[PDB]
Subunit: 337 residues, 3 copies
């Protein structure tokens, strides 16, 4: 497309919503290609990542860890206004894995505090894709400080299975998984720091062990539990988008399955089916489609169970509906032998 | 199906066999859907896992690590009687990844010592699937104490390749891989404990390092080597089911291949082919089909070779038959 | 094929080149099956792996880490002359993952210093495959001393996509990724040694942590940058072969994609498409095909970004050509 042709396209402004929710969109594209406009303000902010009060100086697209999910369709243009407020201390940029050129946009979006930039790219490939900050020389430090999210580029005709049958979800959640590396004192207690820069050296040391202290969804241990548990109903079709910008994960819905899983996150790559546990490598997003069949509580976890239940990588679903005794029944409840 | 239809299905009791062997079954289903009944007794016991007398307080389905492979067909029901003897000291349950609902059955099977339970579930999806204990608040501790196994839900018409041609194995083995986290004292000597609970705090500290002290097949270093090597013959077709309930592995048959590999373990997902090394994520089972072409000793490993050769994740096959010089020949033997 | 049939086949001697370059070859086979002849001399040598002067006692096929890429076509025979000079101190052998029997050739190629051997195997399966040294009882130590590489067995009709459409590359590069485990003294400084054997015990202690001190391409931090950055032009189709003999990796072309990726490395397994980041398990090779569409610098990384940017796993591409503003444009450059 020429400059004139792109200038002629309709523009659509989108208001982002905080994970694990996803901004309103249509699965099947409405009309021809558009320039879809998003704005994110970067916030360097203290966040608490566990019940003990452990603090991280987070670097947060739109003030959240993960950053929000942007949804467009294949061959739309994504136009991001990225703002680095003067209250911040560090330069920041953005690498969209969905994009082609200039280090995914990183080379064109280096903004100092008090600066903004507008990047446009053509979303040429359908799938879910990581985005993350990547300032030359400080790349992993920004990413493991929470400065990452994902986007979804839906096919113009919506999702299909590996054989051309339409797959239409009733709801979608975005689970951003974050490995944190929090320095400890000689008592083995987590350190707090006055400024983000104060924590750098101590944090790099932990990072180099390749052993996160916390592995969490939505920025904190237990973040997607209790009144923040995800929800569904028997018969409801749910898409769970999952990202990890730095480190491998292996999602599992305890009590369920991934009926269709785009484990590579790419929609032209046929999904795996009937999955127990799927695998998303560090630096990628994946998506699983499931129709709930049983009511009750589910745990959705990274199935390294140490990572899930010791380090924080467990969320819950609460599911309404009628129990199905055909699928499963307690023939004899726990009782004396 | 209607209530009367489910009630009318035949019930069949099956006797289990210890890993790496697999109980009697048919690849193609015999007759219609059945309720296949299994019984497993949970044993808490000290086991030695290496050549240095290192102990683990194992938590073992049916007394083995891994627990035994249960084999059914798609749309059968698996009806398990799970027994926790009064001599045990912990509550146990079971999560079948093959099952749908109540945390895979975990929510319905919490049994204290001196209790039993019977769970039935419909095996709606074909594949190999992990099962493991999962008491709320103590999940990884039970799993890394060896309380995990796998089942296989065969398609009613047996296995096929991606092009729908039948794949019929001559034999099947189940390799369960276990990451252990054994505490050490300040001299680097592995610690021993009187009761399982006594090891809890020290063990969790090791677990949180994400670095196992041992990675083993069939519950111990070298358990599937020497006189306990798996066997085959040139021309024989072998299915190797592999599981890891907590941690990634990357199986490899040294000297061979995975001709067809359901790396995700699910039979409705077409198998990868001609594989050198396949990948099974923690919390899953996979299966590899191979036709042996050469006699001799093979190593079957987790191909992180430190895990295989320093930490214990190496098995052998001993294969009989005629050498094939077309496939491989020493043109010049090692010489000056 | 019979012995006589093989003896009648054409022979072709190949001259190997140092990674990341690949020796001259044809994508589509030229004529029928041949016996393709390669020679490699093993060199035990010191390598410097970072800008702090950190040393490894490398054990290097053809003097490089990784060893060179050998390219044949399916159903060719690969005939390797392997030479262990008297100047070396250790026994070495070779396991080709592409080969069938005798532990991939390891059981037939054990050569002491001052010995050579010649191994022939039939390349029956198309794909990229790891090869590595594997002396019994010292297997991972040789592998993580850099004694590994890969081969490519092309289909005789060259590469195709999942739908049978031809994929023809303009350039090919081979990135061998290496995990190193370098001992440190009490002050956290990397130790140096004056013989490979002197480092064994200390190195094993680090290996057993499963935590590499360095993760590098082509034997050193920054090896494939600057004077050794890989190159292309807009429009050019490039195949990137990537291996890791011991440990998982997750390649990603920063600024680009893997248009087609044989993540398992096997050409009869249809490639994944439009990949952001692919995954290659330890003990395997994979291959990604991409057509460059933008000029400029790309980083090619293991996308554990700590591994890439703290531990060394980052390469660059330098790409010539015209910028495409349709694909990407700065609507407003960084400004107040
Ligand atoms: Cu990235
Ligand atoms: Cu599980
Ligand atoms: Cu190998
Ligand atoms: Cu940043
Ligand atoms: Cu248990
Ligand atoms: Cu060697």
């Amino acid at each position: 497309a020429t400059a004139a042709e792109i200038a002629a396209l309709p523009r659509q402004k989108v208001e982002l919503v905080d994970p694990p929710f996803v901004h309103a969109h249509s699965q099947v594209a409405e009309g021809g290609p558009k320039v879809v406009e998003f704005t994110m303000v970067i916030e360097e902010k203290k966040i608490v990542i566990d019940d003990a009060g452990t603090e991280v100086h987070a670097m947060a697209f739109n003030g959240t860890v993960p950053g929000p999910l942007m949804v467009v369709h294949q061959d739309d243009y994504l136009e991001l206004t990225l703002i680095n407020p003067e209250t911040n201390t560090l330069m920041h940029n953005i690498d969209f894995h969905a994009a082609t050129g200039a280090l995914g946009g990183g080379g064109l979006t280096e903004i100092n505090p008090g600066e903004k930039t507008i990047l446009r790219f053509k979303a040429t490939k359908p799938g879910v894709f990581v985005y993350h900050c990547a300032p030359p020389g400080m790349v992993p430090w920004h990413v493991v400080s929470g400065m990452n999210g994902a986007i979804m580029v839906l096919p113009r005709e919506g999702l299909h299975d590996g054989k051309g049958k339409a797959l239409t979800y009733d709801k979608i959640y975005y689970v951003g998984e974050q490995d944190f590396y929090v320095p400890r004192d000689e008592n083995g207690k987590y350190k707090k720091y006055e400024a983000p820069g104060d924590a750098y050296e101590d944090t790099v040391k932990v990072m180099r062990t390749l052993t996160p202290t916390h592995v969490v969804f939505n920025g904190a241990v237990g973040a997607l539990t209790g009144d923040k548990a995800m929800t569904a109903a028997v018969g409801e079709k749910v898409l769970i988008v999952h990202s990890q910008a730095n480190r491998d994960t292996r999602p599992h819905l305890i009590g369920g399955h991934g009926d269709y899983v785009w484990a590579t996150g790419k929609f032209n790559t046929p999904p795996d089916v009937d999955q127990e546990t799927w695998f998303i490598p560090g630096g990628a997003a994946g998506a699983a489609f499931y129709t709930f069949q049983q009511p009750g509580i589910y745990a959705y976890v990274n199935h390294n169970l140490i990572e899930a239940f010791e380090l924080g990588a467990a969320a819950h679903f609460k599911v309404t509906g009628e129990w199905n005794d055909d699928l499963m029944t307690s023939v004899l409840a726990p009782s004396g032998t």
